[PDB]
């Protein structure tokens, strides 16, 4: 049993990608549910669990059967405890791209997630670790990260800091292996 | 030589398409190599062509790092392009950036077939 992962803060998405693409035997993404019809290049149980009934699904959402659910382009997408559970059995760390609320939900489901907050020291720090983002865009991330840490401090297993994404990624790697 | 001229025009067509597929794949961060090769379809054998006629038509070698290589027919690339173009324009026009939108684009892969 491998513990599911949720990274948060600025650079979370690149960190998410790199973990999945650089260490593909240790990390995995789970299969979400969707009400969207399957396309010719998709496969049930691999791409998504395709559901036939948007109503059954809306009901399952209301009954907390998903740790995270959303709509995108007319269709519902949901991430279920069992999908998360299923990746973990296979000895892979489920890399989760989900909100900070999904962490308490995973905690309660007995999944024992590893939540990691990437914390920026300053506004320029964001510019250091997210050399891609703009001056307008880097600013609004510090605001999101401050309010994030103000609300979910007690949900973090660890908090990482750096002057480069190289330093931070390196650290995220170590936190995971340390806590398992 | 009409089969030559037909093959030649087909190879030109494939040469271009493989280039468009490659680019969209790169944009969507699903890097995939498209190479043009030949194949001899069963139609070419059951069509009892005049001797001296070429049996070949273009096929597409599809390669993805750490996954393997597969052949698609030209017709198949041409059809998948319908989907790649769609996904691309959908990507370029999306103003969302949410957990769900991110996952949607991450998982959508008309570029390579898992086959398992």
């Amino acid at each position: 049993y491998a513990r599911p992962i949720i990274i948060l803060g600025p650079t979370k998405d690149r960190a998410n990608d790199d973990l999945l693409s650089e260490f593909p035997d240790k990390f995995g993404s789970c299969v979400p549910h969707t009400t969207r019809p399957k396309r010719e290049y998709e496969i049930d149980g691999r791409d998504y669990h395709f559901v036939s009934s948007r109503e059954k699904m809306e009901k399952d959402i209301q009954a907390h059967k998903f740790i995270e659910a959303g709509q995108y382009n007319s269709h519902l997408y949901g991430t279920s405890v069992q999908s998360v559970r299923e990746v973990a059995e296979q000895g892979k760390h489920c890399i989760l791209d989900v909100s900070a609320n999904a962490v308490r939900r995973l905690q309660a489901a007995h999944l024992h997630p590893i939540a990691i907050f990437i914390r920026p020291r300053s506004l320029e720090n964001v510019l250091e670790i997210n050399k891609r983002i703009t001056e307008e865009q880097a600013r609004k991330a510090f605001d999101r990260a401050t309010k994030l840490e103000q609300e979910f401090t007690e949900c973090f297993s660890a908090i990482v800091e750096g002057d480069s994404f190289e330093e931070i990624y390196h650290k995220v790697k170590r936190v995971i292996e340390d806590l398992s | 030589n009409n089969s030559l001229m037909r093959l030649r025009e087909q190879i030109v067509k494939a040469n271009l398409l493989v280039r468009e597929a490659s680019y969209i794949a790169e944009e969507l961060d699903k890097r995939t190599e498209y190479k043009v090769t030949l194949q001899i379809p069963t139609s070419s054998l059951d069509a009892n062509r005049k001797r001296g006629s070429l049996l070949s038509e273009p096929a597409i070698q599809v390669r993805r790092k750490g996954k393997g290589k597969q052949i698609w027919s030209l017709e198949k690339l041409e059809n998948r392009l319908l989907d790649m173009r769609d996904l691309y324009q959908e990507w370029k026009e999306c103003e969302e950036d949410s957990p769900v939108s991110r996952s949607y684009f991450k998982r959508a892969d008309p570029f390579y077939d898992e086959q398992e």
Side-chain angles (χ1 to χ4, degrees), chain A residues 1-21 23-25 27-45 47-55 57-61 63-103 105-109 111-122 125-127 129 134 138 141-142 144-146 148-149 151-165 168-173 175-180, chain B residues 2-4 7-8 10-45 47-48 51-64 66-68 70-94 96-113 115:
Chain A
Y1 185 109
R3 303 173 74 194
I5 305 295
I6 310 97
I7 304 170
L8 299 163
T11 73
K12 95 200 195 82
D13 295 314
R14 183 188 157 104
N16 275 344
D17 294 346
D18 291 330
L19 285 173
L20 284 168
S21 77
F23 305 93
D25 294 272
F27 300 91
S29 83
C30 61
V31 188
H33 287 77
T34 190
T35 74
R36 180 171 61 61
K38 181 167 57 175
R39 309 169 165 157
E40 181 269 355
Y41 56 93
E42 309 182 288
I43 301 155
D44 207 354
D47 291 83
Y48 298 91
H49 300 288
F50 300 95
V51 330
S52 290
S53 180
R54 157 190 303 274
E55 180 178 337
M57 182 149 189
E58 281 156 354
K59 278 174 171 166
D60 284 346
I61 287 166
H64 311 280
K65 307 282 291 180
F66 305 85
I67 57 145
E68 176 129 316
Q71 190 146 11
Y72 165 74
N73 220 336
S74 282
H75 296 306
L76 295 156
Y77 294 86
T79 309
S80 77
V81 186
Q82 188 57 38
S83 292
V84 169
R85 193 168 264 138
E86 259 155 45
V87 170
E89 325 290 52
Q90 291 149 7
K92 252 137 163 291
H93 294 291
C94 192
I95 289 296
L96 295 157
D97 178 12
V98 302
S99 99
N101 294 294
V103 187
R105 294 166 199 148
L106 290 167
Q107 270 154 15
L111 267 351
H112 215 6
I114 286 165
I116 302 176
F117 180 57
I118 304 171
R119 174 181 144 91
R121 305 175 189 102
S122 75
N125 201 144
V126 183
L127 275 320
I129 62 176
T134 127
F142 188 97
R144 298 228 171 183
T146 14
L148 203 290
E149 183 204 308
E151 178 172 347
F152 304 88
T153 275
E154 299 201 26
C155 291
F156 307 142
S157 327
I159 290 181
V160 306
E161 292 179 12
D163 280 336
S164 164
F165 178 85
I168 281 176
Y169 189 60
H170 196 73
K171 286 181 172 189
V172 162
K173 285 168 62 172
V175 168
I176 292 156
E177 67 163 34
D178 292 336
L179 303 172
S180 45
Chain B
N2 298 275
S3 64
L4 267 174
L7 179 56
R8 191 179 179 197
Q10 289 270 92
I11 287 166
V12 159
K13 176 170 183 154
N15 272 348
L16 271 355
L17 299 193
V18 125
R19 274 236 250 182
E20 179 155 296
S22 284
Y23 169 75
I24 296 173
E26 191 70 27
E27 285 302 278
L28 292 215
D29 197 21
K30 301 266 158 55
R31 177 173 290 177
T32 303
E33 168 197 281
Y34 299 96
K35 270 186 192 169
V36 177
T37 12
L38 299 190
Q39 73 185 332
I40 302 188
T42 327
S43 323
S44 292
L45 271 34
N48 275 25
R51 293 249 299 182
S53 204
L54 298 93
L55 279 23
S56 278
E57 64 190 37
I60 309 301
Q61 170 165 292
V62 182
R63 204 195 295 263
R64 171 97 95 208
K67 224 71 193 185
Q70 58 194 218
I71 307 300
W72 298 1
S73 74
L74 183 58
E75 175 184 28
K76 167 167 172 169
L77 176 61
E78 198 158 345
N79 289 321
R80 275 302 169 72
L81 278 168
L82 267 29
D83 295 323
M84 306 185 194
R85 296 177 187 129
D86 285 353
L87 192 61
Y88 183 80
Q89 180 181 43
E90 202 192 351
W91 180 63
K92 274 311 189 185
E93 279 170 11
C94 186
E96 270 225 21
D97 198 17
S98 54
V100 286
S101 65
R102 267 175 250 131
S103 188
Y104 167 91
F105 290 103
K106 177 192 116 87
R107 298 190 80 78
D109 197 351
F111 305 99
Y112 178 83
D113 291 344
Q115 283 172 5

